[PDB]
PDB file of all heavy atoms in Angstrom:
ATOM      1  N   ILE A 163    -176.060  89.540 -19.865  1.00 10.56           N
ATOM      2  CA  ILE A 163    -175.236  90.747 -19.782  1.00 10.56           C
ATOM      3  C   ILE A 163    -174.027  90.689 -20.706  1.00 10.56           C
ATOM      4  O   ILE A 163    -173.670  91.709 -21.256  1.00 10.56           O
ATOM      5  CB  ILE A 163    -174.835  91.104 -18.295  1.00 10.56           C
ATOM      6  CG1 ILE A 163    -174.315  92.530 -18.187  1.00 10.56           C
ATOM      7  CG2 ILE A 163    -173.799  90.114 -17.715  1.00 10.56           C
ATOM      8  CD1 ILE A 163    -175.317  93.536 -17.568  1.00 10.56           C
ATOM      9  N   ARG A 164    -173.401  89.520 -20.875  1.00  9.98           N
ATOM     10  CA  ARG A 164    -172.314  89.372 -21.857  1.00  9.98           C
ATOM     11  C   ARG A 164    -172.680  89.697 -23.328  1.00  9.98           C
ATOM     12  O   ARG A 164    -171.894  90.266 -24.040  1.00  9.98           O
ATOM     13  CB  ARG A 164    -171.731  87.973 -21.811  1.00  9.98           C
ATOM     14  CG  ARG A 164    -170.294  87.895 -21.401  1.00  9.98           C
ATOM     15  CD  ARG A 164    -169.978  86.520 -20.770  1.00  9.98           C
ATOM     16  NE  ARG A 164    -171.072  86.048 -19.904  1.00  9.98           N
ATOM     17  CZ  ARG A 164    -171.019  84.968 -19.124  1.00  9.98           C
ATOM     18  NH1 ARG A 164    -169.911  84.223 -19.065  1.00  9.98           N
ATOM     19  NH2 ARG A 164    -172.077  84.634 -18.382  1.00  9.98           N
ATOM     20  N   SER A 165    -173.860  89.321 -23.789  1.00  9.98           N
ATOM     21  CA  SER A 165    -174.198  89.585 -25.173  1.00  9.98           C
ATOM     22  C   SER A 165    -174.301  91.081 -25.411  1.00  9.98           C
ATOM     23  O   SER A 165    -174.083  91.554 -26.534  1.00  9.98           O
ATOM     24  CB  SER A 165    -175.533  88.933 -25.537  1.00  9.98           C
ATOM     25  OG  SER A 165    -176.583  89.477 -24.742  1.00  9.98           O
ATOM     26  N   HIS A 166    -174.665  91.820 -24.355  1.00  9.13           N
ATOM     27  CA  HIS A 166    -174.762  93.258 -24.404  1.00  9.13           C
ATOM     28  C   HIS A 166    -173.414  93.899 -24.587  1.00  9.13           C
ATOM     29  O   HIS A 166    -173.269  94.837 -25.385  1.00  9.13           O
ATOM     30  CB  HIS A 166    -175.378  93.775 -23.138  1.00  9.13           C
ATOM     31  CG  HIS A 166    -176.850  93.594 -23.070  1.00  9.13           C
ATOM     32  ND1 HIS A 166    -177.731  94.648 -23.156  1.00  9.13           N
ATOM     33  CD2 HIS A 166    -177.602  92.491 -22.898  1.00  9.13           C
ATOM     34  CE1 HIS A 166    -178.966  94.197 -23.036  1.00  9.13           C
ATOM     35  NE2 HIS A 166    -178.913  92.888 -22.894  1.00  9.13           N
ATOM     36  N   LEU A 167    -172.452  93.399 -23.817  1.00  9.04           N
ATOM     37  CA  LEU A 167    -171.038  93.750 -23.898  1.00  9.04           C
ATOM     38  C   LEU A 167    -170.419  93.428 -25.262  1.00  9.04           C
ATOM     39  O   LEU A 167    -169.659  94.257 -25.792  1.00  9.04           O
ATOM     40  CB  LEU A 167    -170.247  93.050 -22.798  1.00  9.04           C
ATOM     41  CG  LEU A 167    -170.330  93.543 -21.357  1.00  9.04           C
ATOM     42  CD1 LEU A 167    -169.291  92.759 -20.601  1.00  9.04           C
ATOM     43  CD2 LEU A 167    -170.117  95.068 -21.171  1.00  9.04           C
ATOM     44  N   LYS A 168    -170.751  92.248 -25.824  1.00 11.88           N
ATOM     45  CA  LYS A 168    -170.413  91.844 -27.205  1.00 11.88           C
ATOM     46  C   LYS A 168    -170.984  92.711 -28.332  1.00 11.88           C
ATOM     47  O   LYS A 168    -170.254  93.238 -29.159  1.00 11.88           O
ATOM     48  CB  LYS A 168    -170.857  90.408 -27.427  1.00 11.88           C
ATOM     49  CG  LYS A 168    -170.781  90.009 -28.909  1.00 11.88           C
ATOM     50  CD  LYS A 168    -170.711  88.526 -29.115  1.00 11.88           C
ATOM     51  CE  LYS A 168    -170.579  88.240 -30.602  1.00 11.88           C
ATOM     52  NZ  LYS A 168    -169.866  86.954 -30.801  1.00 11.88           N
ATOM     53  N   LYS A 169    -172.303  92.840 -28.388  1.00  8.25           N
ATOM     54  CA  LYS A 169    -172.966  93.551 -29.468  1.00  8.25           C
ATOM     55  C   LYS A 169    -172.830  95.074 -29.427  1.00  8.25           C
ATOM     56  O   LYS A 169    -172.931  95.729 -30.471  1.00  8.25           O
ATOM     57  CB  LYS A 169    -174.441  93.162 -29.487  1.00  8.25           C
ATOM     58  CG  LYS A 169    -174.712  91.673 -29.919  1.00  8.25           C
ATOM     59  CD  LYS A 169    -176.148  91.161 -29.533  1.00  8.25           C
ATOM     60  CE  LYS A 169    -177.270  92.218 -29.747  1.00  8.25           C
ATOM     61  NZ  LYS A 169    -177.377  92.744 -31.161  1.00  8.25           N
ATOM     62  N   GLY A 170    -172.633  95.655 -28.248  1.00  8.59           N
ATOM     63  CA  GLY A 170    -172.467  97.114 -28.138  1.00  8.59           C
ATOM     64  C   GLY A 170    -171.063  97.536 -28.527  1.00  8.59           C
ATOM     65  O   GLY A 170    -170.100  96.835 -28.242  1.00  8.59           O
ATOM     66  N   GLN A 171    -170.952  98.667 -29.199  1.00  8.35           N
ATOM     67  CA  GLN A 171    -169.695  99.095 -29.828  1.00  8.35           C
ATOM     68  C   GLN A 171    -169.054 100.268 -29.104  1.00  8.35           C
ATOM     69  O   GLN A 171    -168.035 100.770 -29.545  1.00  8.35           O
ATOM     70  CB  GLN A 171    -169.968  99.557 -31.254  1.00  8.35           C
ATOM     71  CG  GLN A 171    -170.596  98.502 -32.137  1.00  8.35           C
ATOM     72  CD  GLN A 171    -169.784  97.244 -32.162  1.00  8.35           C
ATOM     73  OE1 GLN A 171    -168.616  97.248 -32.548  1.00  8.35           O
ATOM     74  NE2 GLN A 171    -170.388  96.156 -31.733  1.00  8.35           N
ATOM     75  N   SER A 172    -169.706 100.740 -28.041  1.00  5.68           N
ATOM     76  CA  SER A 172    -169.240 101.829 -27.255  1.00  5.68           C
ATOM     77  C   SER A 172    -169.941 101.695 -25.917  1.00  5.68           C
ATOM     78  O   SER A 172    -170.932 101.029 -25.835  1.00  5.68           O
ATOM     79  CB  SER A 172    -169.625 103.130 -27.906  1.00  5.68           C
ATOM     80  OG  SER A 172    -171.018 103.226 -28.065  1.00  5.68           O
ATOM     81  N   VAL A 173    -169.435 102.322 -24.862  1.00  7.98           N
ATOM     82  CA  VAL A 173    -170.094 102.278 -23.580  1.00  7.98           C
ATOM     83  C   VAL A 173    -171.468 102.935 -23.679  1.00  7.98           C
ATOM     84  O   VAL A 173    -172.394 102.539 -22.985  1.00  7.98           O
ATOM     85  CB  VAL A 173    -169.201 102.872 -22.426  1.00  7.98           C
ATOM     86  CG1 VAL A 173    -167.967 101.952 -22.134  1.00  7.98           C
ATOM     87  CG2 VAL A 173    -168.767 104.311 -22.695  1.00  7.98           C
ATOM     88  N   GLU A 174    -171.596 103.935 -24.549  1.00  8.70           N
ATOM     89  CA  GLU A 174    -172.890 104.583 -24.836  1.00  8.70           C
ATOM     90  C   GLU A 174    -173.911 103.588 -25.387  1.00  8.70           C
ATOM     91  O   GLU A 174    -175.020 103.500 -24.879  1.00  8.70           O
ATOM     92  CB  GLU A 174    -172.705 105.777 -25.768  1.00  8.70           C
ATOM     93  CG  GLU A 174    -173.922 106.119 -26.593  1.00  8.70           C
ATOM     94  CD  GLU A 174    -174.741 107.313 -26.047  1.00  8.70           C
ATOM     95  OE1 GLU A 174    -174.860 107.437 -24.789  1.00  8.70           O
ATOM     96  OE2 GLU A 174    -175.264 108.103 -26.901  1.00  8.70           O
ATOM     97  N   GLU A 175    -173.524 102.809 -26.381  1.00 10.70           N
ATOM     98  CA  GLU A 175    -174.409 101.839 -26.963  1.00 10.70           C
ATOM     99  C   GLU A 175    -174.815 100.782 -25.946  1.00 10.70           C
ATOM    100  O   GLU A 175    -176.017 100.479 -25.792  1.00 10.70           O
ATOM    101  CB  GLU A 175    -173.727 101.143 -28.126  1.00 10.70           C
ATOM    102  CG  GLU A 175    -173.912 101.832 -29.498  1.00 10.70           C
ATOM    103  CD  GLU A 175    -173.399 100.956 -30.653  1.00 10.70           C
ATOM    104  OE1 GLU A 175    -173.369  99.695 -30.518  1.00 10.70           O
ATOM    105  OE2 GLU A 175    -173.026 101.540 -31.704  1.00 10.70           O
ATOM    106  N   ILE A 176    -173.816 100.186 -25.290  1.00  8.84           N
ATOM    107  CA  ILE A 176    -174.084  99.256 -24.197  1.00  8.84           C
ATOM    108  C   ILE A 176    -175.020  99.878 -23.141  1.00  8.84           C
ATOM    109  O   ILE A 176    -175.997  99.254 -22.762  1.00  8.84           O
ATOM    110  CB  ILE A 176    -172.857  98.717 -23.570  1.00  8.84           C
ATOM    111  CG1 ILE A 176    -171.973  98.077 -24.625  1.00  8.84           C
ATOM    112  CG2 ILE A 176    -173.233  97.730 -22.379  1.00  8.84           C
ATOM    113  CD1 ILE A 176    -170.546  97.887 -24.169  1.00  8.84           C
ATOM    114  N   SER A 177    -174.774 101.110 -22.712  1.00  5.89           N
ATOM    115  CA  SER A 177    -175.624 101.680 -21.678  1.00  5.89           C
ATOM    116  C   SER A 177    -177.070 101.725 -22.119  1.00  5.89           C
ATOM    117  O   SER A 177    -177.960 101.406 -21.337  1.00  5.89           O
ATOM    118  CB  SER A 177    -175.213 103.096 -21.278  1.00  5.89           C
ATOM    119  OG  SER A 177    -175.823 103.423 -20.049  1.00  5.89           O
ATOM    120  N   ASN A 178    -177.297 102.174 -23.346  1.00  6.05           N
ATOM    121  CA  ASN A 178    -178.651 102.263 -23.916  1.00  6.05           C
ATOM    122  C   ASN A 178    -179.294 100.912 -24.013  1.00  6.05           C
ATOM    123  O   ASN A 178    -180.455 100.807 -23.724  1.00  6.05           O
ATOM    124  CB  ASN A 178    -178.660 102.931 -25.311  1.00  6.05           C
ATOM    125  CG  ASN A 178    -178.221 104.432 -25.266  1.00  6.05           C
ATOM    126  OD1 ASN A 178    -178.563 105.174 -24.328  1.00  6.05           O
ATOM    127  ND2 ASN A 178    -177.462 104.863 -26.285  1.00  6.05           N
ATOM    128  N   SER A 179    -178.574  99.869 -24.398  1.00  4.06           N
ATOM    129  CA  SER A 179    -179.204  98.525 -24.424  1.00  4.06           C
ATOM    130  C   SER A 179    -179.614  97.975 -23.023  1.00  4.06           C
ATOM    131  O   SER A 179    -180.312  96.977 -22.926  1.00  4.06           O
ATOM    132  CB  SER A 179    -178.312  97.510 -25.163  1.00  4.06           C
ATOM    133  OG  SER A 179    -177.071  97.320 -24.480  1.00  4.06           O
ATOM    134  N   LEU A 180    -179.167  98.623 -21.953  1.00  2.67           N
ATOM    135  CA  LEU A 180    -179.393  98.142 -20.626  1.00  2.67           C
ATOM    136  C   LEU A 180    -180.449  98.994 -19.943  1.00  2.67           C
ATOM    137  O   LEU A 180    -180.931  98.653 -18.849  1.00  2.67           O
ATOM    138  CB  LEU A 180    -178.069  98.192 -19.819  1.00  2.67           C
ATOM    139  CG  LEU A 180    -176.827  97.304 -20.116  1.00  2.67           C
ATOM    140  CD1 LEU A 180    -175.771  97.605 -19.146  1.00  2.67           C
ATOM    141  CD2 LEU A 180    -177.099  95.804 -20.052  1.00  2.67           C
ATOM    142  N   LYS A 181    -180.806 100.115 -20.587  1.00  4.44           N
ATOM    143  CA  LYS A 181    -181.621 101.161 -19.979  1.00  4.44           C
ATOM    144  C   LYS A 181    -182.907 100.562 -19.443  1.00  4.44           C
ATOM    145  O   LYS A 181    -183.335 100.903 -18.345  1.00  4.44           O
ATOM    146  CB  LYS A 181    -181.890 102.309 -20.966  1.00  4.44           C
ATOM    147  CG  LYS A 181    -182.599 103.522 -20.312  1.00  4.44           C
ATOM    148  CD  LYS A 181    -182.368 104.896 -21.037  1.00  4.44           C
ATOM    149  CE  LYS A 181    -182.977 104.927 -22.467  1.00  4.44           C
ATOM    150  NZ  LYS A 181    -182.810 106.244 -23.199  1.00  4.44           N
ATOM    151  N   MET A 182    -183.509  99.646 -20.189  1.00  2.00           N
ATOM    152  CA  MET A 182    -184.760  99.071 -19.780  1.00  2.00           C
ATOM    153  C   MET A 182    -184.680  98.210 -18.478  1.00  2.00           C
ATOM    154  O   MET A 182    -185.710  97.914 -17.860  1.00  2.00           O
ATOM    155  CB  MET A 182    -185.352  98.297 -20.950  1.00  2.00           C
ATOM    156  CG  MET A 182    -184.497  97.131 -21.403  1.00  2.00           C
ATOM    157  SD  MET A 182    -185.530  95.981 -22.592  1.00  2.00           S
ATOM    158  CE  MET A 182    -186.988  95.288 -21.418  1.00  2.00           C
ATOM    159  N   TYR A 183    -183.467  97.855 -18.030  1.00  2.00           N
ATOM    160  CA  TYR A 183    -183.322  97.109 -16.792  1.00  2.00           C
ATOM    161  C   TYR A 183    -183.094  97.997 -15.575  1.00  2.00           C
ATOM    162  O   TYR A 183    -182.980  97.508 -14.432  1.00  2.00           O
ATOM    163  CB  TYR A 183    -182.249  96.049 -16.968  1.00  2.00           C
ATOM    164  CG  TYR A 183    -182.606  95.149 -18.122  1.00  2.00           C
ATOM    165  CD1 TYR A 183    -181.908  95.205 -19.319  1.00  2.00           C
ATOM    166  CD2 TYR A 183    -183.704  94.276 -18.036  1.00  2.00           C
ATOM    167  CE1 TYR A 183    -182.272  94.393 -20.389  1.00  2.00           C
ATOM    168  CE2 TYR A 183    -184.061  93.490 -19.083  1.00  2.00           C
ATOM    169  CZ  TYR A 183    -183.351  93.547 -20.255  1.00  2.00           C
ATOM    170  OH  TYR A 183    -183.736  92.745 -21.297  1.00  2.00           O
ATOM    171  N   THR A 184    -183.044  99.300 -15.811  1.00  2.00           N
ATOM    172  CA  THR A 184    -182.749 100.279 -14.789  1.00  2.00           C
ATOM    173  C   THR A 184    -184.011 101.017 -14.266  1.00  2.00           C
ATOM    174  O   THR A 184    -183.931 101.818 -13.322  1.00  2.00           O
ATOM    175  CB  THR A 184    -181.696 101.293 -15.316  1.00  2.00           C
ATOM    176  OG1 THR A 184    -182.333 102.301 -16.087  1.00  2.00           O
ATOM    177  CG2 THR A 184    -180.665 100.605 -16.214  1.00  2.00           C
ATOM    178  N   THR A 185    -185.183 100.744 -14.837  1.00  2.00           N
ATOM    179  CA  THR A 185    -186.374 101.545 -14.469  1.00  2.00           C
ATOM    180  C   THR A 185    -187.207 101.117 -13.249  1.00  2.00           C
ATOM    181  O   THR A 185    -188.015 101.904 -12.769  1.00  2.00           O
ATOM    182  CB  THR A 185    -187.309 101.767 -15.658  1.00  2.00           C
ATOM    183  OG1 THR A 185    -187.555 100.508 -16.314  1.00  2.00           O
ATOM    184  CG2 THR A 185    -186.729 102.808 -16.628  1.00  2.00           C
ATOM    185  N   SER A 186    -187.001  99.909 -12.729  1.00  2.00           N
ATOM    186  CA  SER A 186    -187.827  99.425 -11.609  1.00  2.00           C
ATOM    187  C   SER A 186    -187.605 100.167 -10.295  1.00  2.00           C
ATOM    188  O   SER A 186    -188.558 100.377  -9.533  1.00  2.00           O
ATOM    189  CB  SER A 186    -187.662  97.924 -11.404  1.00  2.00           C
ATOM    190  OG  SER A 186    -186.607  97.666 -10.519  1.00  2.00           O
ATOM    191  N   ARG A 187    -186.357 100.577 -10.025  1.00  2.62           N
ATOM    192  CA  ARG A 187    -185.985 101.199  -8.753  1.00  2.62           C
ATOM    193  C   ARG A 187    -186.306 100.314  -7.556  1.00  2.62           C
ATOM    194  O   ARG A 187    -186.536 100.829  -6.438  1.00  2.62           O
ATOM    195  CB  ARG A 187    -186.689 102.553  -8.545  1.00  2.62           C
ATOM    196  CG  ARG A 187    -186.727 103.479  -9.726  1.00  2.62           C
ATOM    197  CD  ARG A 187    -185.340 103.753 -10.250  1.00  2.62           C
ATOM    198  NE  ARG A 187    -185.380 104.039 -11.682  1.00  2.62           N
ATOM    199  CZ  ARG A 187    -185.874 105.162 -12.222  1.00  2.62           C
ATOM    200  NH1 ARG A 187    -186.392 106.134 -11.450  1.00  2.62           N
ATOM    201  NH2 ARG A 187    -185.844 105.318 -13.547  1.00  2.62           N
ATOM    202  N   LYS A 188    -186.338  98.997  -7.762  1.00  2.00           N
ATOM    203  CA  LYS A 188    -186.506  98.097  -6.649  1.00  2.00           C
ATOM    204  C   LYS A 188    -185.300  98.225  -5.703  1.00  2.00           C
ATOM    205  O   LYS A 188    -185.423  98.012  -4.498  1.00  2.00           O
ATOM    206  CB  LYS A 188    -186.739  96.659  -7.122  1.00  2.00           C
ATOM    207  CG  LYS A 188    -188.064  96.499  -7.912  1.00  2.00           C
ATOM    208  CD  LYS A 188    -188.815  95.215  -7.563  1.00  2.00           C
ATOM    209  CE  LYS A 188    -190.323  95.431  -7.744  1.00  2.00           C
ATOM    210  NZ  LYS A 188    -190.849  96.659  -7.002  1.00  2.00           N
ATOM    211  N   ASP A 189    -184.148  98.643  -6.229  1.00  2.00           N
ATOM    212  CA  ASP A 189    -182.949  98.735  -5.416  1.00  2.00           C
ATOM    213  C   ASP A 189    -182.112  99.847  -5.985  1.00  2.00           C
ATOM    214  O   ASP A 189    -182.385 100.288  -7.052  1.00  2.00           O
ATOM    215  CB  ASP A 189    -182.225  97.391  -5.508  1.00  2.00           C
ATOM    216  CG  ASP A 189    -181.020  97.274  -4.595  1.00  2.00           C
ATOM    217  OD1 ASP A 189    -180.772  98.086  -3.685  1.00  2.00           O
ATOM    218  OD2 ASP A 189    -180.295  96.314  -4.817  1.00  2.00           O
ATOM    219  N   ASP A 190    -181.112 100.305  -5.250  1.00  2.00           N
ATOM    220  CA  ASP A 190    -180.111 101.169  -5.790  1.00  2.00           C
ATOM    221  C   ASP A 190    -179.448 100.414  -6.935  1.00  2.00           C
ATOM    222  O   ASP A 190    -179.295  99.212  -6.857  1.00  2.00           O
ATOM    223  CB  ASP A 190    -179.040 101.506  -4.724  1.00  2.00           C
ATOM    224  CG  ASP A 190    -179.589 102.240  -3.511  1.00  2.00           C
ATOM    225  OD1 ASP A 190    -180.230 103.291  -3.666  1.00  2.00           O
ATOM    226  OD2 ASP A 190    -179.339 101.808  -2.379  1.00  2.00           O
ATOM    227  N   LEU A 191    -178.959 101.121  -7.944  1.00  2.00           N
ATOM    228  CA  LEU A 191    -178.435 100.493  -9.133  1.00  2.00           C
ATOM    229  C   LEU A 191    -177.237 101.270  -9.609  1.00  2.00           C
ATOM    230  O   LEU A 191    -177.360 102.404  -9.932  1.00  2.00           O
ATOM    231  CB  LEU A 191    -179.534 100.400 -10.229  1.00  2.00           C
ATOM    232  CG  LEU A 191    -179.298  99.444 -11.413  1.00  2.00           C
ATOM    233  CD1 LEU A 191    -180.488  99.331 -12.177  1.00  2.00           C
ATOM    234  CD2 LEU A 191    -178.280  99.910 -12.368  1.00  2.00           C
TER     235      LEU A 191
END
């Protein structure tokens, strides 16, 4: 998660790099 915070240049960019971890819906997120 830190490298995402490092490499992303805006909260938008960071959000998009994380999008693939949000699709399972195993839990509220």
Side-chain angles (χ1 to χ4, degrees):
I163 195 104
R164 243 154 320 187
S165 62
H166 283 251
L167 285 188
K168 169 159 182 152
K169 291 163 40 58
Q171 301 305 301
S172 59
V173 291
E174 154 101 323
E175 271 190 26
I176 305 162
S177 196
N178 295 322
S179 64
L180 293 181
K181 187 155 65 179
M182 63 167 296
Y183 303 108
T184 83
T185 49
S186 89
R187 316 304 151 71
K188 295 221 150 308
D189 186 12
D190 298 305
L191 196 170

